[PDB]
Amino acid sequence: SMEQVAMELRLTELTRLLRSVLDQLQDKDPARIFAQPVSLKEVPDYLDHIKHPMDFATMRKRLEAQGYKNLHEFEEDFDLIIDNCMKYNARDTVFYRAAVRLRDQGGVVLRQARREVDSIG
């Protein structure tokens, strides 16, 4: 149907905007602390601590399968990256502090992305 096609075009356009949001968020992590999943080889106990691991590579895989239906879903995954890190790592660590900075800086980007996703529909 043409209705199904039009919906697909909207998903595709959301996907393009989210790809740029993701690139911008990731630039706020120049150290690449959040680039890849936490290794179970190097933190064998990780899954006893953190129930839903997340990282930028996993987000990117989901995005390219057009697996985010809306900005809310994408933000949930970004928030997991930050929130997981602030639970597993202590306040006085390079990891926790990198999450704080990603959150603060990412908040700016997400504030306007929410307006762009509303605005362009």
Side-chain angles (χ1 to χ4, degrees), residues 12-15 17-40 42-60 62-68 70-93:
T12 299
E13 285 309 289
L14 174 66
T15 302
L17 184 157
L18 294 183
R19 189 172 307 125
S20 160
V21 175
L22 180 61
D23 292 347
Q24 285 178 73
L25 288 173
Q26 191 151 23
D27 292 334
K28 311 303 171 152
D29 169 37
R32 297 187 79 82
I33 292 165
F34 309 108
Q36 296 295 327
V38 168
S39 178
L40 306 172
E42 298 145 11
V43 191
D45 79 342
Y46 189 66
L47 301 183
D48 297 336
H49 295 264
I50 295 298
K51 296 309 174 180
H52 300 99
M54 195 41 60
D55 67 90
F56 284 132
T58 303
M59 297 194 55
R60 199 179 292 284
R62 184 165 165 186
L63 187 60
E64 295 310 326
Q66 299 188 342
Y68 298 112
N70 59 53
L71 181 60
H72 182 72
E73 290 192 346
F74 175 108
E75 287 175 312
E76 284 191 338
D77 273 355
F78 178 63
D79 287 339
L80 274 181
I81 292 176
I82 295 311
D83 287 344
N84 284 353
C85 182
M86 298 170 72
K87 288 168 189 77
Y88 188 82
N89 301 106
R91 214 148 44 242
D92 74 319
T93 62

